């Protein structure tokens, strides 16, 4: 879309309807006459547009009302209400822009933010934007969290998120204008290369790909048309459903074969019965011929009975000879029909062993998307976020994804090498307890009005706790933390001196010997100016490969690569970097997925702030003090960087609404 139209779409907003968000801040409007709603909607969309077309400058309210036009620019308050709602909730003046109005001399409120991942950094940026005093506590010696970029010399390569999934309605679109991000389109041509090293023939490539997609729809059919969602008291996973679909297609192939062979034997039987009728008739002809010859022998002149005998025995043989002619007519058609059925036999197999291996690579592909074995994905909800898809082609970052957090981080108070260990939250405020990661004897106490926790789901899942909560988080939050899944996916960065692959190929597959190792080094990316190939390890392979040395893993990489290009073409790598996100203690995983037994409802429980009980019993129920952001808290856009940016923007808005107050709901 385009216009004030397009600005709504490019802010994930319905252009013609008011959201549940806005119903809450503008209950007058949404309950008011329909004409006014249209008015509000336009001044929403136009401000949106004004921000979007130049997002390197702050969009002031009074710079806004100036570009606004009558009759819209008539209600000065509705404009001010709209602009402030947008500004609070991070739809405008978010990211990295030049402050027109400079920052307030004196601040209000104190927020401690745990983690400088993008979710924390975005919140922090916004809270400081709103006039609060913010400090981030970072366990690592760098910002970005799971946005991690390797840099040695001119070699650069993301160990963490590396793909922007489409600028159509993506907040990273805004960010890219705001920060120099060199975005490179992903060319969708990907050739598979079996374990022998020879490319899959284009014809087989296309056939198995369509079985994969056919197989996916089939599970969707088991899920939604057949309510095959719980099996023997346990929720069904996607992988389970794929087996039952593959099995039923294997069963159907046997049924076709049985039915076709059964038709042949039925036709054979018809024949066998026909042949017996013919053999008896032929033997019955036999004695009749003999009888006619004996009767014929009696030479004339003969009495009528003898003449009748000849005439009679002659009818009978002619008649039975007519009958044997009709039955070799009937054996003719049966003989040809049996040849037809023999030459028209249905497929012997549903999938060949080579065909099944290709299918794995598509499954490893999907285990890469959801950073987890398909046996863990919920069949019912693994594609619950299918609807919110961004438009445009996927892109990668040539300069490394780090440049974004590093950019967000300027002007912010980040304490690095600072590992939080307790979070204490009470009716009257909070204290966060952190240590030095270098020497853990050193100990720090941070006091504040609210804590924003962006701890990774894998960290929050750790047993025994890497971070104590005082008092303990309530059972509804811990149960969502268990139920939700935190997957794993790892990369191997391969650093050579000269390109030796198809450079117009961004990316090419390798097909696994076994199905158990389908994710093990199944895919390679070339998306950098320098000669760097990047190899994925997904599915079950990810967890296994972390117990296996760097060198042996580069070992198996080189093997793969030799088979596809020849032992003479592929040098030893200058630099090798293999990730281990599950072992990383500041992540303990790569991203989350919708586990079987979980749902998108869990992602929302994950984002509910915590409100401590009263200090003085009988005292009025207090303010919430513990807020959560990060990839696992945004239900509609999880496991991504854009969802993590949005989570931080959402919490900043929610925190400001409680500590600075909202003056836009009147």
């Amino acid at each position: 879309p385009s216009g004030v139209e397009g600005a709504a779409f490019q802010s994930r907003l319905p252009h013609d309807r008011m959201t549940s968000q806005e119903a809450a801040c503008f209950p007058d409007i949404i309950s008011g006459p329909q004409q006014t709603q249209k008015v509000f909607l336009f001044i929403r969309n136009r401000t949106l547009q004004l921000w979007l077309d130049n997002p390197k400058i702050q969009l002031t309210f009074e710079a806004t009302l100036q570009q606004l036009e009558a009759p819209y620019n008539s209600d000065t308050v509705l404009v001010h209400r709209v602009h402030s709602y947008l500004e609070r909730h991070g739809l405008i003046n978010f990211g990295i822009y030049k402050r027109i109005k400079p920052l307030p001399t004196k601040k209000t409120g104190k927020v401690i933010i745990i983690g400088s991942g993008v979710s924390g950094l975005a919140a922090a940026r916004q809270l400081q934007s709103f006039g609060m005093d913010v400090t981030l506590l970072e366990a690592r010696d760098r910002v970005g969290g799971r946005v991690a970029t390797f840099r040695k010399g001119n070699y650069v390569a993301d160990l963490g998120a590396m793909v922007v999934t489409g600028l159509g309605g993506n907040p990273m679109a805004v960010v890219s204008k705001q920060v120099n991000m060199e975005l490179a389109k992903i060319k969708q041509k990907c050739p598979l290369y079996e374990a022998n090293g020879q490319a899959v023939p284009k014809e087989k490539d296309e056939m198995v790909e369509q079985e994969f997609n056919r197989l996916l729809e089939a599970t969707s059919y088991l899920s939604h048309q057949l309510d095959f969602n719980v099996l023997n008291n346990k929720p069904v996973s996607l992988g389970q459903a794929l087996e039952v679909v593959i099995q039923l297609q294997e069963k159907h192939v046997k049924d076709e074969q049985i039915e076709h062979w059964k038709k042949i034997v039925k036709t054979q039987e018809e024949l066998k019965e026909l042949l017996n009728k013919m053999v008896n008739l032929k033997e019955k002809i036999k004695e009749l011929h003999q009888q006619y010859k004996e009767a014929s022998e009696v030479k004339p002149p003969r009495d009528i009975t003898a003449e009748f005998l000849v005439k009679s025995k002659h009818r009978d043989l002619t008649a039975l000879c007519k009958e044997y002619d009709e039955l070799a007519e009937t054996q003719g058609k049966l003989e040809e029909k049996l040849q037809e059925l023999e030459a028209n036999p249905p497929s012997d197999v549903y999938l060949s062993s080579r065909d099944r291996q290709i299918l794995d690579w598509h499954f490893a592909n999907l285990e890469f998307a959801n950073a987890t074995p398909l046996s863990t994905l919920s069949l019912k909800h693994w594609d619950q976020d299918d609807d919110f898809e961004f438009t445009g082609s996927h892109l990668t970052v040539r300069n490394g994804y780090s440049c974004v957090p590093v950019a967000l981080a300027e002007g912010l108070d980040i304490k690095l090498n600072t590992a939080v260990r307790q979070v204490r939250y009470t009716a009257s405020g909070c204290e966060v307890i952190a240590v030095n990661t270098r020497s853990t004897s050193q100990t720090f106490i941070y006091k504040c009005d609210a804590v924003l926790c962006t701890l990774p789901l894998g960290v929050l899942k750790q047993q025994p706790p890497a971070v104590q909560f005082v008092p303990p988080l309530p059972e509804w939050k811990t149960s969502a933390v268990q139920r939700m899944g935190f997957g794993n996916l790892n990369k191997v960065v391969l650093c050579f001196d000269r390109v030796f692959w198809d450079p117009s190929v961004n990316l090419f597959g390798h097909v696994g010997s076994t199905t158990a190792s389908r994710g093990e080094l199944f895919l390679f990316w070339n998306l950098y100016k320098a000669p760097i190939l990047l190899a994925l390890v997904a599915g079950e392979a990810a967890g296994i490969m972390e117990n296996i040395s760097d060198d042996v893993i580069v070992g198996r990489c080189l093997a793969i690569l030799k088979g596809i290009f020849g032992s003479s073409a592929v040098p030893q790598p200058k630099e090798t970097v293999v990730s281990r996100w599950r072992a990383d203690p500041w992540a303990r995983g790569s991203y989350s997925y919708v586990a079987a037994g979980s749902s998108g409802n869990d992602y929302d429980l994950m984002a509910q702030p915590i409100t401590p009980g009263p200090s003085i019993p009988g005292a009025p129920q207090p303010i919430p003090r513990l807020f959560f952001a990060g990839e696992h808290t945004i239900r509609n856009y999880p496991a991504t960087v854009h969802g993590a940016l949005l989570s931080g923007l959402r919490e900043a808005g929610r925190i400001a609404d409680q500590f600075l107050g909202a003056m836009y709901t009147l």
């Binding site: 969708q188 990907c190 998307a369 959801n370 594609d383 976020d385």
Partner: peptide, 4 residues
Amino acid sequence: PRSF
């Protein structure tokens, strides 16, 4: 979520 899935890719290409």
